[PDB]
RNA sequence: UGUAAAU
């Protein structure tokens, strides 16, 4: 801090004017200050002339260092974001012009101010508040090779992305699902804590549901496009997917969200399906198998019923069953007691048994019994587990109400 | 008895 602003204890002096930081020459160390960046936020909050707009344009996003210096500060991004939009308020001669330099200005740092902590809210809030037109152009400077990979996992860069899907249209970051989409790349995205967002946020935009009903005949068609393109990809690493830590997220949402229903269906019955004994004892995928399961059309619904109660060979040994297993595995047993919730709804009329005005509650009611028959033949067993007594509490309660 | 974002 400039020596001509302190006071008799080294303190910032009050009573100090806009124009007086203006004029110094100073504000740039005024911007890196706690306390100046805090009198600087609030006095351009004021009734600014217009040669004072002039002068903080200049000193703030006029030069390309100074503004990349005040972008990566703590205390200057903010007053950055702040001039930011003064200008696009300023409807004078330089409007488009600020606007331009300031979209070259980031376009040519595009990499280095995703990845750090205080320029890539200056690049959000660009992308949000500029004239969209020139807010597109910003997202063809995204890099198109490793970087790219790097900034989907990167815990700033991320939300750059993430922004990027929310607020511009899907023609201008095309490019950024065929990235995805490219085998090694999905691998590697999906699988990391803040790519796995990355990729579930791109599929919500994908998706046609009632926040994209504004969307143009020829838009949803653009749409629909990327969304195969990326679907494919997804589905064809499906397994590995479903069993990640991070990415098992992407394959529940895709299962669980019935505006992609056809991509539910393929995933069901192309992965999960023959695999659902394996799957049901991974601690990441039996979640999946619980939303498969709850949110399967009929038929398919009745196909995994039927892997479960009769699809795999009982073991040599014992005769213990699929059933036999699952009941008392310590991720199994959520499924199980999923397949009974299902049921207990149905019966119960909690759950839809018309699949288009055709009636499945005669197949509930068998897969209900089933199940009922197991748990009453092996209470004594069940009753020793917190999954069994569940079961048998449901069980009971259920049929002294019906 | 079972898992996820940065001023």
Redesign the pocket.
């Given at each position: 801090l400039p020596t001509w602003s302190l006071d008799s204890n080294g303190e910032m002096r009050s009573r100090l004017s806009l124009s007086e930081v203006l004029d110094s020459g100073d504000l740039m160390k005024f911007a890196v200050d706690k306390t100046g960046c805090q009198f600087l936020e609030k006095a351009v909050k004021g009734s600014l002339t217009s040669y004072q707009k002039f002068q903080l344009f200049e000193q703030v996003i006029g030069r390309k260092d100074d503004f990349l210096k005040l972008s990566t500060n703590?205390?200057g991004?903010?007053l950055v974001?702040s001039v930011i939009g003064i200008s696009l308020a300023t409807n004078d001669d330089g409007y488009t012009k600020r606007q331009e330099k300031l979209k070259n200005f980031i376009s040519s740092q595009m990499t280095d101010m995703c990845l750090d902590?205080?320029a890539?809210?200056?690049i959000?809030?660009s992308l949000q508040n500029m004239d969209l037109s020139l807010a597109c152009k910003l997202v063809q400077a995204l890099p198109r090779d490793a970087r790219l990979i790097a900034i989907c996992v990167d815990?700033?860069?991320?939300?750059?992305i993430?922004?990027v899907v929310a607020v511009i249209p899907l023609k201008n970051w095309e490019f950024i699902v065929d990235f995805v989409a490219t085998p090694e790349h999905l691998r590697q995205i999906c699988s990391d804590?803040?790519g796995?967002?990355?990729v579930?946020?791109i599929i919500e935009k994908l998706t046609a549901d009632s926040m994209n009903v504004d969307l143009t005949s020829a838009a949803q068609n653009l749409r629909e496009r990327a969304l195969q393109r990326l679907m494919t990809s997804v589905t064809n690493r499906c397994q590995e997917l479903a069993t990640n830590?991070?990415a098992?997220?992407?394959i529940?949402?895709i299962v669980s969200n019935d505006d992609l229903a056809v991509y539910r269906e393929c995933i069901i019955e192309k992965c999960l399906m023959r695999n659902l004994l394996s799957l049901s004892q991974e601690?990441?995928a039996?979640?999946?198998?619980?939303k498969a399961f709850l949110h399967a059309p009929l038929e398919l619904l009745a196909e995994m019923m039927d892997e479960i109660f009769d699809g795999y060979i009982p073991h040599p040994d014992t005769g213990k069953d699929a059933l036999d297993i699952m009941m008392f595995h310590?991720?199994g047993?959520?499924?199980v007691?999923?397949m009974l919730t299902i049921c207990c709804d149905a019966v119960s009329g909690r759950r839809q048994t018309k699949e288009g005005g055709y009636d499945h509650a005669i197949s509930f009611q068998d897969w209900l019994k089933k199940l009922h028959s197991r748990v009453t033949k092996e209470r004594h067993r069940l009753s020793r587990?917190?999954?069994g007594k569940?079961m048998i509490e449901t069980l009971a309660n259920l049929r002294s109400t019906h």
């Open positions: 703590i205390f991004n903010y974001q902590k205080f890539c809210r200056v959000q809030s815990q700033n860069a991320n939300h750059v993430q922004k804590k803040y796995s967002y990355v579930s946020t830590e991070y098992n997220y992407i529940q949402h601690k990441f039996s979640h999946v198998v619980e310590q991720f047993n959520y499924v007691q999923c587990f917190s999954s569940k």
